[PDB]
Amino acid sequence: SINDSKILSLQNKKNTLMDTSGYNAEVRVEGNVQLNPIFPFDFKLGSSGDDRGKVIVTQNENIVYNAMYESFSISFWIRINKWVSNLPGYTIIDSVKNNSGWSIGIISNFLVFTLKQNENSEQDINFSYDISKNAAGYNKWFFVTITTNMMGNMMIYINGKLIDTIKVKELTGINFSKTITFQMNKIPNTGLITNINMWIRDFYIFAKELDDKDINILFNSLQYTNVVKDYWGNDLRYDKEYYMINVNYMNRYMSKKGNGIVFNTRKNNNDFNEGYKIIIKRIRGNTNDTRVRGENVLYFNTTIDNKQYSLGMYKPSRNLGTDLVPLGALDQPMDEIRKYGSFIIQPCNTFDYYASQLFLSSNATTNRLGILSIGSYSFKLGDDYAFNHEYLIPVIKIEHYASLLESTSTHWVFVPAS
């Protein structure tokens, strides 16, 4: 519908970056640019070195002319790896020719869109990620939508949510370039506190100011909502080591004491690589292509010493509560996993994270019996003898959980160990 205004559609088809909008803009790829052979077919760039990746898109002057000076929108999926809060300045997507045009860049924890009228004046809008929520860096995939009305407002959205909006000032003289260059270029004197990577996918430009309904419709149509995602936004897969973390306890890694799985405080935040890892194993599903999907039935394996256990319920040293059963690491055969350690997963994404929900499966079927949560309880594990100890553990609220159904403490994330 809004497709009518799509004037640039930068995509990877037949393994070649090209404008598929119909206006055959010219796409010249230079240096180290890696194209992904499988969805999302993203292309990877880097602040590499001499021959760093560089995608050049030269378009039609007439098209630009009859569009940019009124209203237009830019949308695309982007991922920057190791986007730390004290990151130095970088221009990533640029469309400025003679000190005029528009540019998109990053600095510290900001993604900023600048409308440059000349080398003396510009106006900009930006998004700044919550640092406290992304201490390990904002390294997830996210969708950007920048809508500009030269007679109205400049608005920026992140994953379909309006982030900021300012009234565009008089920038007469501003002259848009019919050229856009993708390349990570360091801006001198922006605090160089050290080599990052960036992936882009489906870079669009519309000759109209897209509104909410439109932005979000585009947003969704660009993804397979039934494919659960890992913490960074890539497709979640079976047979791969991941660090399983609960959304409410991001500073906790997985450990074990006896039959139970206990959660310990991680050392620091520059990483998520601490403690034991899990491997998701598929039991039932529609598609069989390695991607974890909506109603799939699965179990979790984990190698601890030189032995591998599976996650399942277990009787605690004492009852922890009504309809509450702990989840631990058990060396059990498959019949035992169907009864005590099988889960039906459901994707659960929010503006803040790519997470999932896990329901206790009944005999490895899609019949739910409870939800998976976390909490601290007092009982004994391993060689706990004389006293009872508080252990933050993965717990299942069995029959009645309509309330937890709404809690972030049932939101599970998976960071790839890689």
Overview of the molecule:
The chain is mainly β and 418 residues long. It folds into 2 domains: 230 residues, Jelly Rolls (Sandwich), CATH 2.60.120; 188 residues, Trefoil (Acidic Fibroblast Growth Factor, subunit A) (Trefoil), CATH 2.80.10.50. Helix content is 6%, strand content 47%. Strands 1, 2, 4, 5, 7, 12, 13, 14 and 16 form a 9-stranded antiparallel sheet that branches.
Secondary structure blueprint with pairings:
Elements: E1 6-13, E2 16-19, E3 26-30, E4 34-35, E5 43-46, E6 54-58, H1 61-68, E7 71-81, E8 90-96, E9 101-107, E10 110-116, E11 122-128, E12 141-149, E13 153-158, E14 161-167, E15 179-186, E16 197-206, H2 212-221, E17 241-246, E18 252-257, E19 260-265, E20 278-284, E21 297-303, E22 308-313, E23 324-330, H3 334-340, E24 343-350, E25 353-361, E26 368-379, E27 389-397, E28 412-416
Antiparallel strand pairs: 1-2, 1-16, 3-6, 4-5, 5-16, 6-15, 7-12, 7-16, 8-9, 8-15, 9-10, 10-11, 12-13, 13-14, 17-20, 17-28, 18-19, 20-21, 21-22, 21-24, 22-23, 23-27, 24-25, 25-26, 26-27
- How many strands? 28
**Overall 3D form:** elongated
Number of helices: 3
Largest sheet: 9 strands, antiparallel
Query: Which architecture of the largest domain per CATH?
Result: Sandwich
* Computed CA radius of gyration, to the nearest angstrom: 24 Å
- Span of the ends, CA to CA: 40 Å
Share in helix: under 10%
Oligomer: monomer
Beta-strand percent range? over 45%
Subcellular location: Host cytoplasm, Host cytosol; Host cytoplasmic vesicle, Host secretory vesicle, Host synaptic vesicle membrane; Host synapse, Host presynaptic cell membrane; Secreted
Organism: Clostridium botulinum
Domain Clostridium neurotoxin receptor binding N-terminal: 14-210
GO biological process, one term: proteolysis
